[model samples]
Target: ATFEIVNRCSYTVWAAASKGDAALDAGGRQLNSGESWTINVEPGTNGGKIWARTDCYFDDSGSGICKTGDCGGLLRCKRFGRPPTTLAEFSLNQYGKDYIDISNIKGFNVPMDFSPTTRGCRGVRCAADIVGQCPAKLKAPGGGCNDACTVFQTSEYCCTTGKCGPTEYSRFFKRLCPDAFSYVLDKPTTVTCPGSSNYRVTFCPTA
Candidate 1:
């Protein structure tokens, strides 16, 4: 499997990804406008996540931080990124299918699209302008919106237990990106493509 990371944003972005017990070989890299990076994935790869970091500043040694999506302040992330980020998640070759989605459950920073290049597979995208219209209380200091779980940190918002349902907060994101995972209990957000299909993940695809 392979993932082509395209940067369509006006500004630079650092792309990052992690799968299984290992991080992507191109764990993190700066992508200028219109540039793209491609990473090859091995077979049996599962539960991988890809996202972008914005407003970042790094040194020659690759030690720096990002206003959003910072992973322990490291250029190469060995773990999941911080909140207030749009996530492209995947589980390839699982149960005879490739499960994928654009997740806003952590919150949205940039618009994203995830599509399969193979025939017979569908594509999913979340291109809503969530940053400008984010609710004041749910807004991140630097940019992007904050997930209810991250803001309230309560059981009802986090869906820590029981059969929790969507609130007005979760509904906000759902209304914008209906195809994304809006909350912890959000269902019907995943799309299944044919196994071994190649995929494209674009940041700010409309820009």
Candidate 2:
């Protein structure tokens, strides 16, 4: 399986992935407008995430801080990115089936399109202007929206107990990103697709 991560943002973006799937340029790669990077995934890759970091500055050693979606202030992300960022999640080749989802459970940054490249498979997107509509308390420092769980630190938004429901804030995200995980337990967002299918995750997507 393969993943094609594209950048459509006006400024540069440092694409990032989780540790297990950091094969895409070692967890972080620089992408100018319209640029893209691809990764070949091993069959057993599971519970991995992909995201973008903005307004970053890295020196020769590839160490820097990003305004949004920063991963421990390192360009070569040793772990998953911080919140207030959009996410594309995948668990591929899980017993011959693939599970995929576009999620704002971390919050929102750029517009995104996550879909199977093959026909007859569904795609999911969360391309709303979430930053523009971000609530004051949920807004991040350098432009990006924050998840209620991060701001409030409550199980109601975090859903740590698996007994939480949607709040007004979660609904705020849900209303805009109906195809994304508004919260951890959101519905109709996760897609099941065939294993070994190639997929694409585009940031700041256009029609």
Candidate 3:
């Protein structure tokens, strides 16, 4: 969520876009300097686009979002959503650094074969990939490094090199397990998690 003028001298003044069904009409009314409003949108309501205008023109003719037709200007948009939560714990070795990390289990479940597209590592949509490459790979566009291993340590794959190497995945004890924690069994059921970075164990229900 960062923005900068791709075209350095594009405009001298910038403001947050106005969003709504009648964005064109809304943008028509100019605002004084240093004033803003927060706009909320329900999934499939009105045309989904925010509009930003310049002080140089009062015709809403400057660059802005167009709902029904192409307004032919820039109407920047900033998406809002919840943050990430850790799901599981594992070890990582990359560029020669080794440390224990936790994955947000809020959306991770798979057969022990770690895939880049899996829930854990698939950016905000998944959590497994976050555990393998915390700050480095986790924050990357496609969920960090590709060299991820399965929970059981039975398989390993290198996403950067695009090769499944002879690596092992193992679930060593976290020095704490069954210490009054929650667990997930089936694949489709999702759990609501309070925020935490503490160490915990995930049992396969039937086990």
Candidate 4:
């Protein structure tokens, strides 16, 4: 299977990926507008995320930072991308199916669309320009919207305990992008596809 990363934005975007234990083969790379990059995934590979970093600058040694979705100051991520990112998550060949979603639970930095390339697999997308309308309370310092849990760190917002459901904050995101995961425990956001199918992840899809 493969994950195709497409840049449909007006500017350049640095794509990053991280999976368990395994080293990232295409962790950090630049893709100008209209360009694309594809990363091959092995069978049974599961549990990882793909995101786009914007307004980034790296030195000759590839040691620099990004305004959004910086991965610990490294161009090639060894860990998960920072919050205020739009993430495309997946699990391939798991229990006879592939699980995938476009999640903004950690907050949104860019518009995205995640669609399976194979037949009969439904597509899910979040093309809203959330940053433009992000609430002041959940705004990130650098850019983009921050999750309520990240901003509040409270049980009510984070859903750490009790039978927590969507709050006004999460509802804001959910209302905009009904197909995306707006909160950590969001259950209806996930979509299942046949195993070994290729998928396309587009950044700033509406741009």
Winner by TM-score:
1
TM-score, one value per model: 0.96, 0.95, 0.19, 0.95
User: How close to the true structure is residue 15 of candidate 2, measured as C-alpha lDDT?
Assistant: 91
Model 3 CA deviation exceeding 4 Å by range: 1-29, 40-43, 59-207
* 49-152 per-residue lDDT for model 3 (tens digits): 22222322323435543221123343332321111222222222223321222232221221011112112222111223323434332232322211123222
Candidate 2, overall lDDT? 0.86
lDDT of 3 at 173: 11
Please list the residue runs of candidate 1 whose C-alpha ends up more than 4 Å from where it truly belongs after superposition: none
TM-score of 2: 0.95
lDDT by residue (tens digit), candidate 1, 1-207: 888999999989999888735687667888899999998877667888899999999988888999889877878776778889999999888878889998888888888999997877778898988898898889999888888899889889888888789999899999999999998888878988888989999998863
Task: Give the range of the ten consecutive residues with the poorest summed lDDT in model 1.
Answer: 19-28
Clashes of 1: 0
1-207 per-residue lDDT for model 2 (tens digits): 788999998989999977442544468889999999897766768888889998999989988899898988888775788888898989888898889998888899888999999765799999889999998999998879999998999899999986889889999999998999998877757888998788999999886
Backbone clash pairs for candidate 4 read none
- Give the Cα-based TM-score of candidate 3 against the true structure: 0.19
